[PDB]
């Protein structure tokens, strides 16, 4: 599905934080909050070159 | 404590009302005496509740049949008795109005209607 991996709101925390420069889900009251997204190496993320 | 639908259909309005009143009185009394030692009395209460529903359904159905017979030959019927269908289907043109066509088109079709024919191989 073309919407797979993109049905989330994530933004990179920044550069100077001692964490990987990866988009992270906003929020703050669930396990999903703060986790990486939008990447091929991230769990529950998009696959590399999605099949068409 | 079970009331039969066939017997209810056979019976008329006054007997139906009498049975409904008896069932309601029995249900009230047996609920009052049920609140202590609610058992097979609970089973009986479930039975009378279903029986009251059945009697009410029979009374309502007979009344609606009578009303439909009364409004059989009248232009406007109650909205409850008018067919539901769909809002669009109700708004839709009637069959007569949809099939009604102009007189000139009628004449053209009368005197030149699609013919039956075949072409030899």
């Amino acid at each position: 599905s073309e919407k797979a991996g993109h049905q989330t709101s994530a933004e990179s925390w920044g550069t100077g934080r001692a964490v990987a420069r990866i988009p992270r889900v906003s929020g703050g009251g669930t396990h999903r909050a703060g986790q990486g997204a939008f990447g091929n190496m991230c769990r529950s993320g998009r696959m590399f070159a999605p099949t068409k | 404590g079970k009331v039969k639908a066939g017997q209810l259909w056979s019976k008329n309005k006054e007997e139906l009302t009498k049975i409904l009143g008896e069932l309601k009185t029995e249900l009230s009394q047996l609920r009052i005496q049920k609140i202590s030692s609610s058992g097979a009395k609970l089973n009986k209460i479930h039975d009378l509740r279903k029986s009251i529903a059945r009697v009410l359904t029979v009374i309502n159905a007979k009344q609606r049949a009578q009303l439909r017979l009364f409004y059989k030959n009248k232009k406007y019927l109650p909205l409850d008795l008018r067919p539901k269908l769909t809002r669009a289907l109700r708004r839709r043109l009637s069959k007569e109005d949809a099939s009604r066509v102009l007189e000139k088109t009628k004449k053209r079709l009368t005197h030149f209607p699609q013919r039956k024919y075949a072409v030899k191989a």
Partner: protein
Amino acid sequence: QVKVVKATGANRGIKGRPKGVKGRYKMVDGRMKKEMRALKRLAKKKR
């Protein structure tokens, strides 16, 4: 003016503004040390 904050201790892996009450802050890392060295070597090559 702009205060520089090391992302270590209580400041490591935090979402936003740390406890430092100031107008403007800047988080730093060793990853940024290497970025900074790359920027200066490019600048010196250009000059």
